[PDB]
Amino acid sequence: SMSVKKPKRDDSKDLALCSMILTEMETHEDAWPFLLPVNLKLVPGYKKVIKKPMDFSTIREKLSSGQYPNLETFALDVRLVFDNCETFNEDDSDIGRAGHNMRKYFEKKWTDTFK
Numbered sequence: 001s002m003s004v005k006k007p008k009r010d011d012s013k014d015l016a017l018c019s020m021i022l023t024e025m026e027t028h029e030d031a032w033p034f035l036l037p038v039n040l041k042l043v044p045g046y047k048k049v050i051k052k053p054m055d056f057s058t059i060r061e062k063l064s065s066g067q068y069p070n071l072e073t074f075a076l077d078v079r080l081v082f083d084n085c086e087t088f089n090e091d092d093s094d095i096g097r098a099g100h101n102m103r104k105y106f107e108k109k110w111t112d113t114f115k
Contacts, residue, residue: 011070011071014070014071015063017071017113017114018063018068018071018074019063020113021106021109021110021113022056022059022060022063022078024105024109025056025078025102025105025106025109026056026060028101028102028105030097030098030101030102031056031098031102032098033085033095033098033099034055034056034081034085034098034099034102035055035056035057036055036056036057037053037055037057037058038050038053038055040053045088046088049087049088050084050087050088052080052084053084054077054080054081054084055081056081058077059074059077059078059081062077071114075110078106079103079106081102082099082100082102082103082106085098085099086099086100
């Protein structure tokens, strides 16, 4: 409350650490469905169904240009990429499996880097 603060958690490295995580996601072999925005002209249904499209390149640009206020807003966009993927793709598809693999990969790096 006013003039009553919890001890200040050091957030000075968060930008660099989220960048490193994102590099590792970018270079994973199963990243390929996620590297670029889904082409809304060429993928029937995507535009209407997926209200907030997100992809690694778009997160990378947001990150590089100070559009994440804190590390939680960064994790929300990463999770959105996987949530969108589950919304649109069957679990038993290459892309569906890719999404589950990447989300697992991300959540471990997240916990190990910050928790």
